[PDB]
Write a protein that binds this ligand. Sequence first.
Ligand code: E00
Lengths: 90, 88, 103, 102
Amino acid sequence: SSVPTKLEVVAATPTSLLISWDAGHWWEWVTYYRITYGETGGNSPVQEFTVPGYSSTATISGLKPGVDYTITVYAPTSDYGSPISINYRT
Amino acid sequence: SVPTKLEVVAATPTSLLISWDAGHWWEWVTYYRITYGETGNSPVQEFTVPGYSSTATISGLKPGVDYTITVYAPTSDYGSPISINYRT
Amino acid sequence: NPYIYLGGAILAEVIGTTLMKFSNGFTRLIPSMGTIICYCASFWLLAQTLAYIPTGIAYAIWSGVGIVLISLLSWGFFGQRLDLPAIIGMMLICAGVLIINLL
Amino acid sequence: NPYIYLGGAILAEVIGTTLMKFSNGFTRLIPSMGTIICYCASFWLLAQTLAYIPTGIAYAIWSGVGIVLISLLSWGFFGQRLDLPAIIGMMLICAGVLIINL
Ligand SMILES: C[N+](C)(C)Cc1ccccc1
């Protein structure tokens, strides 16, 4: 009973990823999801960009091929719901 | 009265760089709309520029043709719209 | 509909305020969009009514109904917190408003 | 604490409505942007101060200190023309504030 739910990578690409999630019910929709991505190794911080909360898809660009990455989708808040994080090797 | 100081700075046969005095802070207006067309047989063209910006560019003009350019206030009660003439 | 129009703004705002509690700091879509939608409708027709209706009538009606409508809407939608005793203060706050506008 | 932000939102709406009267119908860029900033902040202030205090309570205090501060700076801007009903009615709602505030 947490939002978002079901974080998947729709389309892949060596330098880009297309992902989506289940925003839940209409009362579970939020105003802005902030999404964070970075390297799996952890020798770097984390890149962050927001996206309005009426859209359930997000496109990321500027990745390096072959490297395994970790993607995490947040909420406008964070201490009131639960986030999801996945991995993907381009 | 508020849109003032209208003259062409740089003039290419196909483009015109225009500027104006956007007033002065408290008389700064939200936007200025710029209308340029043939001096008309051909249709007239229009776009808008934010009001903090005192300059704007006009591209895609035919060489030699004389044009008429008009810069309007975002509303009206800032004075008559200033207009001039130039030949590329 | 001359004053019923004015009553449309006071009620549209009465609704949007109670929806703002659900907006959760403009972080919950549908109430966050709802409270901005209820206020722009209040904005719209307020400019319409104010063409004929004066001024001190609008605020005085706003205070009274809003102190009554949304407080009774908060007594039903959510409940009550209350961090000071006198409830009659809102009516006396309104009374101080009534005798600075109408008087 | 909560009545500090409520009074802050009172000051915010008052500044926004005065900058609206200065600018024309969404025209004068500097006060027009000042109105948008003052509103989006006051709305974000009310959206945060209403979860603390009861909604009807902040509604009254704002409707009170709203006109109180609007007319307060009215004599300090145009030399506005009123008198006894305005000043004693100000202290009336102001007293009404005390019994809904701390
Ligand atoms: C969006 N309003 C015009 C209703 C602002 C307001 C006015 C008075 C009291 C609370 C809020």
